[PDB]
Amino acid sequence: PFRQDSILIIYPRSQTTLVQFGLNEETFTVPELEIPTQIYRTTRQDGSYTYHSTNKDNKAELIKPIQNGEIIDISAFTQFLRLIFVSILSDRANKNQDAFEAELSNIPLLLITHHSWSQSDLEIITQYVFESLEINNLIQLPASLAATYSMISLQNCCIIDVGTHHTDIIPIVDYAQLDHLVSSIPMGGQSINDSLKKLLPQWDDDQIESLKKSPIFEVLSKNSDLEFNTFWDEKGNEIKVGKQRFQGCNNLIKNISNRVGLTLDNIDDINKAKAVWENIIIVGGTTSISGFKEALLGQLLKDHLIIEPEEEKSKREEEAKSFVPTIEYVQCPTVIKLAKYPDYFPEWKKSGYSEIIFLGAQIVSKQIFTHPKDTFYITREKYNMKGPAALWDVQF
Amino acid sequence: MDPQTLITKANKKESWRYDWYQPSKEKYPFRYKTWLRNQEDEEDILDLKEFDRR
Amino acid sequence: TLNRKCVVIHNGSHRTVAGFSNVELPQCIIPSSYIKRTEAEFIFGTYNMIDAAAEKRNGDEVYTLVDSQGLPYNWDALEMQWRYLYDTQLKVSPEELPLVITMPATNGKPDMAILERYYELAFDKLNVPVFQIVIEPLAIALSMGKSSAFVIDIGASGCNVTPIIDGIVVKNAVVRSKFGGDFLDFQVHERLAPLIKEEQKRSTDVWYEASTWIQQFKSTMLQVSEKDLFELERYYKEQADIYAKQQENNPLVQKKNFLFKPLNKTLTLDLKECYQFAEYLFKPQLISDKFSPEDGLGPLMAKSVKKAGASISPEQVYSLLLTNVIITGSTSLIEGMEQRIIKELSIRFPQYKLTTFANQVMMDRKIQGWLGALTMANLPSWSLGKWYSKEDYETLKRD
């Protein structure tokens, strides 16, 4: 144990699910498999359910198991995992045919979880992985920790994970996710869309979405020099736009910031707190919008930095006209910083770090699965003894 | 091949249920759900490549 | 160990802590209060309330769940809170798992009436399978490897002093001070009032301020002086005169700076004014002429030990208690507090050697009550605690 060919990482999210089977060994590659997170559920007279990849003869209903990051249908969710897992087996079993003795003989699974999943959901998933998929080794890695492990392993930090309809804020102290501080706001990328609809009434949804995803949309805090600029439709249609391309991100940025502030203010050990504020981690699709992260930082500074009020400072400098020492405050944060990205994953640098949580998982899985110690995953041994409850003896 | 048999041929053994349990000292008056071990007696495929990015 | 997983709930008078027995920290710490927003409607949770509070909307009002006894007094609201916890935080039917909850040490009287209201809530309403009630000072002490201890809990409602001898709680020596965290909030506010402009029904703003800047101020400005402050002052003065006179630095003149956010304004206190707030906990005769020095924490601790010596030698109980002093509670984390509680105890009992114990980890004392209940829930035998079942209720219901 274990073959690197064999490591399987799954990262399921509301819209899609990133998947990878086998680690490259030279450098880590950005996940190439992206499967939409949904399954079809046919209902068979007599009550029971059947699950397929396609609307079978238009008889099945379309189930989207994960919504706003939460599992809303645990049965369709487990069926969706099986569907992924089986597909991978078939694919490899064709290509190579001796696969069941090699690449498919011992498949350890790392499943990236979301803060919102029940213990009940996590146990059921564990049961499913050991009983239905007949897999033997499982790590359930929280998304937040994947984040901090990718980010050159930070003991103290805050994860701001911007989704489409919600943003999660998750403080990490001493490599532990602080559950009672964790929260999400019902606000994300779509907010930008919505802000823009108000500013550009005569546009439609696809036009607005296209602007957001275009080279000329940025958050300010040379394109910025031009009054108007140009970009091209999804359907090739050229669209011109004024100052609106520097708008629409503000309401979201303010909401996130207000939340970050209330959160970090409830970290009880001020020495931990100082560290967290100095390692803000921002992740998610939205964050790839040029200027966004820096704009968000800018706002956290504007709202939360402990520093002398400018008027007060200006008086003191007039007074000294007749050198001014710095006023020291008892509060934190006096320093706010974004955590430093690792620049030595070439493939990741190339594609941006909106999905860096996955790199977290590539690193953890290699660590854990290419070393003897079985301290951080459930094994068959353990499953046989405690069952799904085995899960809680290997939490991080 | 049959998905179920693919699952069966890879990765090579108990089963648990989540059910009512009534502890004893004989038996306490109360119940509670837990993961109990069971006694002796107790669809499709998708094509990657569509989902591969290109 | 046992094949079970419990829900552990602690309803303090200020904070409520909830989570499962299988992990080291609680899933949630939320306020033991709620907003009633008006068709009525009930808001629970730290961010939900702070958001709603900042909205500053009429008709919004904050109400509490736990009286100053540390006991629930609004049981319709308590159910809504429990529902909220089980639905949105633990996310599990209350019917599945055993429940472990806390009560504060009492003199014994309110006990039966409470137990009944809990039956009604746990059974009639929620359908909980079975529950245990642990006594907070007792569990905290056990969680700390101690069977006998003098447990000094400084929370929001005041100080709660509880001698515990060989696993048993001495009820007649149970003592609850009236001055603690919430009191400190009032004083910080009244004193800073003129620098921040400011100088029930207006509960919403009182609450929001207590939960925001006032909380930060307490954690960063206040300190407890090691020795009676009036004496410290006379001394520091008497010394300062000599340094001055001698040639031809008084520590109380150090300044401390707090950025007050709502007005982007610096508030500066000298160290004396920082020491002053907690002095009230020790010498409450310094606010009103209506408080005797005996309502102060020092006399109170002493009173409770002496009432322990009356069991049912004294200079033995005295010796037991004083070699197992436990200092606990959110407010006990204010810098200088342990040392003053110790100095205050040591001088009322000079013949004896005091040894005190305290969780030094910031988080863990704030929730040490919940931590205590947690370590009860992980006890290896069902026989270690009284576990009330639906039965017990049935049988009490008879005549």
Binding site: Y344, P346, Q367, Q395 | - | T375, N378, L379, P380
Partner: protein, 69 residues
């Protein structure tokens, strides 16, 4: 008799609770340590990944800068 019983019973209740409490506390500390230890190792793993990349990139640039195309 019914006393010698009750007493030893009581003494053992306390003795065993104290035991569980001490064991639980040591388990906290252990989990906390194994956690901090895993974190602090990944930092080292990162450092090695970084050194390896640097060597790789350096060998690449070195050939690139002294050869066409």
């Amino acid at each position: 008799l019914k006393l010698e019983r009750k007493k030893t019973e009581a003494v053992a209740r306390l003795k065993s609770m104290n035991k569980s409490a001490i064991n639980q506390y040591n388990r906290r500390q252990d989990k906390k340590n194994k956690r901090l230890k895993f974190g602090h190792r990944l930092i080292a793993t990162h450092t090695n990944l970084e050194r390896d990349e640097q060597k790789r990139a350096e060998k690449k640039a070195k050939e690139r800068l002294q050869a066409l195309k």
